[PDB]
Design a binder for this molecule. Structure first.
Ligand SMILES: *C(=O)[C@@H](NC(=O)/C(=N\OC(C)(C)C(=O)O)c1csc(N)n1)[C@@H]1N=C(C(=O)O)C(=C)CS1
Length: 473
């Protein structure tokens, strides 16, 4: 006797996964064998072919139990029952219905033929949701996801993917104060109510299971290590001329090569690999690795989603010069979009990392101070200048608010366009990561492709959360 599976809701109680009654029909072939004249009407009502159905019953004539069909609607099930065929019996089972469909398909996940979790929350909280067959019903679960922010993020990421002719994308929104995942969307997506088709690529929760090189989006962590060392201040200068730096057989290169002296904010604005590498040589890679490890890059999230990827943060006992530079500019590191969002949330939350949660958090757990508050506050200010200053990532500006962030562009020529940031700068509330895989139009830089999505989504999410606009006199 299958048990009723627990309702999944969003954080405000909107239904996301609902157990729906279905009819399963079984037969005692010993009794069905006494009513062969009824078989063709029964075959037609079950959908099945006349002769194939007849062959099936004859083959199981000595059995006392066989399944005829599973998961009919309790309309077609009543239609088979109205035939009054001897030996035909019914069992009430459950099939999930997902009211928001493709919009939250990767996060909510789905169930297999036996109504057991196969992907996402359905799989991760299967014990909680499943209950026990007879029969004790499963328990309700409220997610951290806010369906209003989810609809917005879904729409904007889909629109950006079409405008850039991209292969795939992910967008995660986090509450920096509580560790809650407020939205998590990917493209391509699928309709979890359509149990035919089922494209494995479209079902991938990319924000959690796909690893990527974060590139320039890790530079704020390298800078946090520089400021915490006691050796660097934002007004310090680094000479990046002539825009390249030879380290043995390896050549570090900047995209814009018309700089000489840059201050630390300028290094982030211009996204100078040479500048961040020179700072890394001075402070040592051990300090940078420790910040990136502590914010969770390439570390287990603790979420318990089977198949979730940990990625990799390279480590050494003695760091060679090339690896010191590449670590500092995010080359050769492998992270997930959830990890990158969580790292930006700790930075935004004055350096305190609050544990990640996919469920609504009522009592917030204690956070861990990973970056000193003063250092996190200084880096936040630099990231606000990255968005607001002359020559900055102007497309990440959020009209009405002070926003902060960092763009990234990774050469996989195929590219991945990134933007990670938070808002409002006066008292950060939300961190967001936008990852667009293989944009195919003229623009591929993170500040061109991903920054406008951050702006559109952040503009709506702050307003949906009634956050007061902070760009005031
Ligand atoms: C940060 O992401 C920087 N990106 C890189 O240096 C990488 N590649 O640079 C390009 C120009 C795309 C290349 O083809 O080599 C890179 C880092 S990890 C990886 N696999 N590739 C800088 N980021 C930006 C930005 O803000 O988006 C720039 C405009 C200058 S390069």
């Amino acid at each position: 006797i299958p048990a009723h599976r627990g309702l999944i809701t969003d954080r405000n109680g909107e239904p996301l996964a609902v157990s729906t009654p279905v009819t399963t029909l079984w037969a005692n072939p010993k009794e069905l064998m006494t009513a062969k004249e009824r078989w063709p009407q029964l075959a037609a009502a079950l959908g099945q072919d006349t002769k194939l159905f007849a062959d099936r019953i004859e083959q199981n004539a000595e059995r006392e139990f066989i399944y005829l069909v599973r998961g009919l609607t309790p309309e077609q099930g009543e239609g088979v029952i109205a035939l009054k065929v001897p030996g035909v019996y019914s069992i009430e089972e459950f099939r999930r219905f997902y009211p928001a469909g493709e919009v939250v398909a990767h996060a909510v996940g789905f169930t297999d033929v036996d109504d057991r979790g196969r992907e996402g929350i359905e799989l991760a909280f299967d014990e909680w949701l499943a209950g026990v067959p007879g029969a004790k019903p499963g328990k309700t679960l409220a997610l951290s996801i806010d369906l209003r922010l989810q609809y917005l993020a879904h729409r904007e990421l889909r629109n950006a993917l079409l405008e850039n002719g991209a292969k795939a994308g992910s967008l995660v929104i986090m509450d920096v104060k509580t560790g809650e995942i407020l939205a998590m969307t990917n493209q391509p997506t699928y309709n979890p109510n359509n149990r035919r088709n089922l494209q494995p690529a479209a079902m991938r929760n990319r924000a959690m299971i796909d690893v990527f090189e974060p590139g320039s989006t890790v530079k704020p962590f390298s800078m946090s290590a520089a400021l915490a060392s006691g050796r660097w201040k934002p007004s310090d200068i680094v000479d990046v001329y002539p825009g390249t730096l030879q380290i043995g057989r390896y050549t570090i290169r900047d995209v814009s090569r018309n700089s000489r002296q840059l201050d630390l904010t300028g290094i982030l604005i211009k996204s100078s690999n040479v500048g961040i590498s020179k700072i890394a040589f001075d402070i040592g890679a051990e300090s940078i690795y420790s910040v990136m490890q502590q914010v969770g890059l390439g570390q287990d999230t603790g979420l318990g989603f089977p198949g979730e990827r940990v990625g990799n943060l390279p480590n050494h006992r003695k760091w060679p010069k090339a690896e010191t530079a590449t670590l500092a500019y995010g080359y050769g590191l492998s992270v997930t979009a959830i990890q990158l969002a969580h790292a930006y949330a700790a930075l935004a939350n004055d350096g305190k990392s609050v544990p990640l949660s996919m469920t609504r958090v009522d009592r917030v757990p204690d956070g861990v101070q990973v970056i000193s508050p003063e250092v996190a506050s200084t880096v936040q200010g630099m990231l606000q200048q990255v968005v607001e200053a002359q020559g900055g990532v102007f497309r990440a500006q959020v009209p009405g608010y002070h926003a902060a962030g960092k763009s990234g562009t990774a050469r996989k020529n195929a590219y991945r366009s990134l933007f990670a940031g938070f808002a409002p700068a006066t008292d950060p509330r939300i961190a967001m990561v936008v990852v667009i895989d293989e944009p195919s139009k003229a623009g591929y830089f993170g500040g061109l492709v991903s920054a406008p999505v951050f702006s559109k989504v952040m503009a709506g999410a702050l307003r949906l959360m009634n956050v007061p606009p902070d760009n005031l006199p």
